[PDB]
């Protein structure tokens, strides 16, 4: 059955292309993508010698997105629920986003503000997951990470920002997460399963990922080295 996108949704791209409007004026999809990755890694590198924030919240998450993608996108740091005014005079919007190839949607734009508030309140009620065993830290991060993944509050760059956010959160809490330990395919399978499956099966998809990236080899005692 027929589908096409509203004009405000298409205003994220150059007319007649699938290339996101960008500050570099890069018209090629592949070339933009590669350059975004390069820019973002450079920034991830800087963040290693920057202080951790006092509060992990959506404000920090927006700050990080602006850092990661601000050289590329006018809208870096802005959440996709809001109408976005480009310098070119167009106004863009992305209320609905789904997992490509599915009918499985991320949060509707109408709920993003409320949902980010709820995210913020869970972290505040638990003091940024400080003072926890590795077991409780994994349980609570799995839930919070699935929730933020579902929200997908930016036009793009969601996964990259949520990874660094959670790596910084774990560092601050006295644990460690390192998403680079596993492949993209493994990460995206856990994320897609968290949204596609139900109940206990959905939680377990993401828990296996979290166990793998959180220094599980710490149980190996090598005192005699």
Residue numbers in the entry: 1 to 225
Paper lines:
Proteins containing a FIC domain catalyze AMPylation and other post-translational modifications (PTMs). Among these, Bartonella effector proteins (Beps) comprise a particularly diverse ensemble of FIC domains that subvert various host cellular functions. The FIC fold comprises eight conserved α-helices and encompasses a characteristic active site loop between helices α4 and α5 that forms most of the catalytic center and the substrate binding pocket. Additionally, FIC domains generally contain a β-hairpin between helix α2 and helix α3 that is referred to as the “flap” and mediates docking of a target segment in extended conformation via β-strand augmentation.
BepFIC domains with a glutamate (E159) in position G2 are represented by the B15_Bep8 and B11C_Bep8 structures, which are virtually identical. Although the motif is highly degenerated to PFxxGNE, the fold of the domain and, in particular, of the active loop are canonical. Nevertheless, the binding of a triphosphate-nucleotide appears to be impossible due to the presence of the side-chain in position G2 (compare Figure 9A and Figure 9B). However, simple outward rotation of the glutamate side-chain allows the accommodation of an AMPylated side-chain in a constellation very similar to that of the Tyr-AMP target side-chain in the IbpA/Cdc42 complex. Intriguingly, the model would allow binding of water molecule to the N-terminal end of α5 ready for a nucleophilic attack onto the phosphorous, which is in line with its phosphoester bond with the tyrosine, i.e., it is ready for deAMPylation of the modified side-chain. The strict conservation of a glutamate in G2 may then point to a role in water binding and proton abstraction, i.e., the glutamate would function as general base. About one quarter of BepFIC domains display a glutamate in the G2 position which would clearly interfere with the triphosphate-nucleotide binding mode observed in AMP transferases, i.e., with the γ-phosphate forming a salt-bridge with R2. However, binding of an AMPylated target to members of this group of BepFICs appears possible, which suggests that they might act as deAMPylases with the glutamate in G2 involved in binding and deprotonation of the hydrolytic water. B15_Bep8 Fic crystals were grown from a solution of 20% w/v PEG 8000, 0.1 M HEPES/NaOH, pH 7.5. Data for Bqu_BepC FIC, B15_Bep8 FIC, and Bcl_Bep5 FIC were collected at 100 K on a Rayonix MX-300 detector at a wavelength of 0.9786 Å on beamline 21-ID-G at the Advanced Photon Source (APS, Argonne, IL, USA).
